[PDB]
Structure 1
């Protein structure tokens, strides 16, 4: 049976503490639609209640302690969370937790730290003398105390910050001085060294820190009974740390712990290097495909549809790609805003959901909408495609990426899924038809478009071929009627 994950959040969900409850209540519907894993937002305390979670204040406060002005996180309390996970797991849906280990924000107090400024465009170039800054690096977790963990964070657990509370300059990155203090390596080499992203950057060279994060990772998996992770900001975290943290957590828990890293670069070579340095022990989001889809959707029909998978992880390394159309960073108004145009979204979902390559992810924003921007729910258009994935997308695949507008693939179906088999055909331009082979054994069958976009039927010829059709700027997915 086909695996499908859903990112069950968007950036602009309301701060009403009701999200875990909504997820609990949707667990049954999600399973019905063929969702098999749910990626949940950061469950811990961020820098305030309305923090999406990536502010990472206290990884041991899952909406449990009164900290940063709130007991609950944005999404709800710890018990509402456990009860969502229970409901998901009772519906046979796995839960992947987001993991933010790059930095900590929202420190309880500042420390006077000797530091040097480096060039934000080349973090290896020091551009000041050493001097003392006031850095937000002291974490004492007053509201939690030592419950679950007595680890306290101090300046020497971090490599730098971008904010001197005493001087308050923007566009500064401060590297901490101290014995053995250096930006972590290997990380992405954009800006010379991209270890520093925001807030207080965690020093992955620090043995106390490595041990703490490993232990936290076990605690988090154990406390929530997680099935895997989405690892945030991996281009900024020492690659060997991530590789080994994941191996540690899997070994400690005896669980598979499927993991997908967000390595946000539109560059297969960088992704492949990350995969090499992490020994292929986890998957990456297919950021290149995302940009291919985004660009195609903006190309008014003129994208060469035959090249849609070019340069992508899913083309090259299908077993290590999590494919996605959009996410909470690419949604409108966000940091990596590159939102696939609505008309193209169904074609994009069909590409990720009906092909045998990649582990596809459905975005909450797409499925349910983003009311704050004017993004309607596309559930009605995604549902037929999820249905295709769940019941029909099985067996040998034949691709037809051979025209600049109309492309397609078929799936021969297989014995373990009765009536499985499909032919997906799409056009970013005028409609048209394509002959495609669905399997000799399907000769004589009458197929219909499960999306309903093309009325009518197609009968498979004696040889297992048919002339499948699609409307302009549309996808049709033909399956045995």
Structure 2
């Protein structure tokens, strides 16, 4: 396999959970991640790891105490759904030896599970008194100095609940609607901003994560988001990875509003093309999405996540059932974006036998400039990676069929590698393809759903 200079290895993200998945994940995470690292996964998005209101039953999004990573006895348990902090720290060390960066699912927008009610003057009853043992232990003046503030999480830490404002509050400068659920956190209050900057430092520099997936971040004040990202980046030696879950109509607008070069965003709109792909009738010449937009460099592409694919389909999203490998090929091999392999696809749906080779194709071959194919048809999409002049053996000519016909079809494509012989890394088409002196070869693809993708890369 071609050997890539480490600093140039493509980042391939793996979402290491789906809904209700993997109770006790932390203990098992080293084993799960060992083969994934061999394939070419270089980062995993872990489920929200902080204590949530429903204890071991919580997936993590009903977050209670951001400073309690399965360490303190609260909400009925010490461990989270996934395990104790010790098991998490050992998981992080294992992933570290394996070369994998772990991203934290931070839930900034809301809190749930108050320890007691309060009477808020001029308002009434609210579930706003939060005790937060983990905060008491780690958010101390000794640890954080200038970022430490003596204040209690009660109703003055929140904008409000049930889309009603608490006295003297306002929702903030939010790109989406401000209120989603729970007790909406007031990031217009200075002491909360500073504590969150301290927590971001703790997660990277002390706990040992390498980046964040930012839950519902478009419901959160945009100025705080920018200032917290900017603070954590300046505060860390590594280049920390930030990806927004900004599930809005205009994700380009959201990124321009936050206005930090460190923030990426999930490509929600590219999925609509995979929805069309699943029909088996999509015109394979047209592709939209963030990854073909003026923010394409800041795109994090995916096929499904725990909201889009979930038993019962609770958010009513159209499903991506068919042609899923062609969808994964599209996100994995093209030059732009950081792609996400979804655990439910790899694991539960059992797509690992075919996905394994696509992760390797991205890992060891998808390098050099990218080229679109003037010869795309209504039924076949093709794409080229030149490869690396420095690394002979890189480059790829990929083809995907959006039809279930049977048989093959071939396309004359310029690989930009003269007089080079290729072969199909996927094992879907047999034989070789030899290019001519100007770089062109005749590459086939199978016109089926089940095997309708091919990734031709140069022979050893």
Global fold match (TM > 0.5): yes
CA distance in structure 2 between the partners assigned to 1:364 and 1:73 by the alignment: 20
Q: CA deviation at 1:294?
A: 2.2
The equivalent residue for 1:39 is 45
Q: CA deviation at 1:227?
A: 1.2
CA distance in structure 2 between the partners assigned to 1:424 and 1:315 by the alignment: 21
Asked if 2 retains the 8 angstrom alpha-carbon contact of 1:322 and 1:360, the reply is yes
How many pairs does the alignment contain?
A: 431
Residues 243/417 of structure 1: CA separation in 2 closer, same or farther (3 Å cut): same
The equivalent residue for 2:453 is 475
Residue by residue, what CA displacement relative to the aligned partner does 1:299-338 show, whole Å, maximum 9, x if unpaired? x222222112x24344432210111111111112354454
Residue by residue, what CA displacement relative to the aligned partner does 1:5-62 show, whole Å, maximum 9, x if unpaired? 11111113143x2x01221223332221111111111111011211110111001111
Secondary structure at 1:479's aligned position in 2?
A: strand
Question: Does 1:215 find its partner at 2:198?
Answer: yes
Residues 335/245 of structure 1: CA separation in 2 closer, same or farther (3 Å cut): farther
Secondary structure at 2:270's aligned position in 1?
A: helix
TM-score by length of 2: 0.89
Asked if 2 retains the 8 angstrom alpha-carbon contact of 1:314 and 1:358, the reply is no
The equivalent residue for 2:271 is 290
CA RMSD across the alignment: 1.9
Asked if 2 retains the 8 angstrom alpha-carbon contact of 1:314 and 1:321, the reply is no
Aligned pair partner of 2:391 in 390, 398, 417 = 417
Q: CA deviation at 1:175?
A: 1.8
Question: Does 1:361 find its partner at 2:352?
Answer: no
Question: Does 1:75 find its partner at 2:82?
Answer: yes
CA distance in structure 1 between the partners assigned to 2:92 and 2:64 by the alignment: 22
The equivalent residue for 2:147 is none
Secondary structure at 1:60's aligned position in 2?
A: coil
- Farther-moved stretch of structure 1 (279-288 vs 60-69): 279-288
Asked if 1 retains the 8 angstrom alpha-carbon contact of 2:68 and 2:135, the reply is no
The equivalent residue for 1:455 is 430
CA distance in structure 2 between the partners assigned to 1:56 and 1:296 by the alignment: 36
Asked if 2 retains the 8 angstrom alpha-carbon contact of 1:328 and 1:334, the reply is no
Asked if 2 retains the 8 angstrom alpha-carbon contact of 1:3 and 1:359, the reply is yes
Q: CA deviation at 1:295?
A: 3.1
Residue by residue, what CA displacement relative to the aligned partner does 1:57-116 show, whole Å, maximum 9, x if unpaired? 0011111111111111011110111111111111211121111111111111112236xx
Map residues 155-304 of structure 1 onto 2, 5 A cutoff: 155-162=155-162, 173-178=163-168, 181-188=169-176, 194-265=177-248, 267=249, 270-281=250-261, 282-297=263-278, 300-304=279-283
CA distance in structure 1 between the partners assigned to 2:297 and 2:114 by the alignment: 39
Aligned pair partner of 2:350 in 377, 401, 409 = 377
Question: Does 1:325 find its partner at 2:316?
Answer: no
The equivalent residue for 2:12 is 4
CA distance in structure 1 between the partners assigned to 2:260 and 2:199 by the alignment: 23
The equivalent residue for 1:101 is 108
Question: Does 1:306 find its partner at 2:285?
Answer: yes
Residues 396/254 of structure 1: CA separation in 2 closer, same or farther (3 Å cut): closer
Residues 94/416 of structure 1: CA separation in 2 closer, same or farther (3 Å cut): farther
Question: What residue ranges of structure 1 are gaps of 5+ in the alignment?
Answer: 115-130, 163-172, 189-193, 370-375
Secondary structure at 2:381's aligned position in 1?
A: strand
TM-score by length of 1: 0.85
CA distance in structure 2 between the partners assigned to 1:437 and 1:212 by the alignment: 55
The equivalent residue for 2:370 is 397
CA distance in structure 1 between the partners assigned to 2:390 and 2:318 by the alignment: 37
CA distance in structure 2 between the partners assigned to 1:403 and 1:312 by the alignment: 22
